[PDB]
Design a protein around this ligand. Structure first.
Ligand code: EAX
Length: 303
């Protein structure tokens, strides 16, 4: 029987929340299509880091990618609202928003930019790490040189803390931290652990300053050529991928502080979040003007 082999990649390790996502997706696609579609999985930025990969999928040089929302505004501007600091109360809030009508509407914004966005998934809440000093209050961030993703909302937000930002593809981060080009970076525990950033970062604070969604993306032309039953199979495979992805994030978050302490990191997990929110007031006010009160309240009031 005719079979098609496609490729999907991530910037992170096979042994991570995102590796679980794409391995689960590949297994489900094969099962739900009775072997007529197979998906080869690639890790650690093989086939490109996130921005390059989203571009590649748009071009069609490979078929699929799983990416955080970080580089997405370079392609689909509507997702920026999700990247606002301190927008989501907790993972349940974020997941409910993305799975429900608000997130579905955002998926439709990908169609006109040459993707099928199969499903929302999760990277996690992001936390600040660095080599220089323990961060116990927002003032401790001032002057730190921090790598960021290629995301305009994060860059503006972190400048609000007095951080000196440098956007970089994820594939360059470990080496930049090791060499001291930047003092630090920010990422969920799922990434910090799987990327072994404990080896090149002494300090971590659970600032939880933004929620980082992720997405399964497919080249639109390729998706549209799938038979209808197979389109449905790919969507359902992605949703199952998101389920196991989120479960792994939950496990990582539950055990991660003890794990990273055992590995030698000084992890500050007791901070006054209100103080960090207050520090961003000027930039918060700009985001409120940018996205509008209705859209931000629509998300904040979701339950
Ligand atoms: O820091 C980043 O670039 C991302 O969190 C990473 O590629 C996983 O999605």
């Amino acid at each position: 029987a005719a079979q098609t082999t496609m490729r999907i990649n991530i910037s992170t390790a096979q042994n991570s929340h995102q590796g679980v996502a794409i391995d689960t997706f590949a297994k489900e696609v094969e099962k739900r299509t009775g072997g007529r579609y197979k998906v080869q999985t690639f890790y650690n930025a093989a086939l490109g880091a996130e921005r390059e990969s989203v571009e590649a999928v748009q071009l069609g040089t490979h078929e699929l990618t799983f990416s955080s929302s970080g580089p997405i505004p370079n392609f689909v501007p509507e997702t920026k609202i999700l990247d606002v600091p301190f927008l989501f109360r907790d993972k349940a809030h974020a997941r409910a928003v993305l799975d429900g009508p608000i997130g579905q509407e955002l998926l439709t914004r990908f169609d006109g930019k040459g993707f099928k966005a199969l499903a929302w998934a999760e990277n996690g809440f992001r936390h600040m790490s660095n080599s220089k000093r323990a961060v116990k209050e927002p003032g401790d961030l001032k002057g730190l040189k921090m790598r960021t993703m290629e995301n305009p909302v994060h860059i503006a937000a972190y400048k609000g803390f007095g951080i000196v930002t440098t956007p970089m593809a994820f594939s360059e981060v470990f080496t930049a931290l090791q060499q001291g080009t930047v003092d630090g970076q920010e990422n969920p525990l799922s990434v910090i652990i799987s990327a072994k950033f404990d080896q090149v970062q002494k300090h971590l604070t659970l600032t939880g300053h933004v929620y980082s969604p992720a997405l399964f993306l497919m080249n639109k032309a390729l998706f549209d050529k799938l038979p209808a039953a197979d389109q449905q199979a790919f969507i359902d495979a992605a949703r199952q991928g998101a389920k196991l992805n989120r479960a792994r994030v939950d496990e990582d978050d539950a055990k991660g502080v003890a794990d990273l302490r055992a590995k030698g990191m000084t992890v500050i997990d007791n901070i006054d979040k209100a103080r960090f929110v207050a520090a961003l007031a000027p930039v918060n006010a700009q985001f409120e003007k940018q996205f509008g009160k209705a859209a931000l309240e629509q998300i904040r009031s979701a339950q």
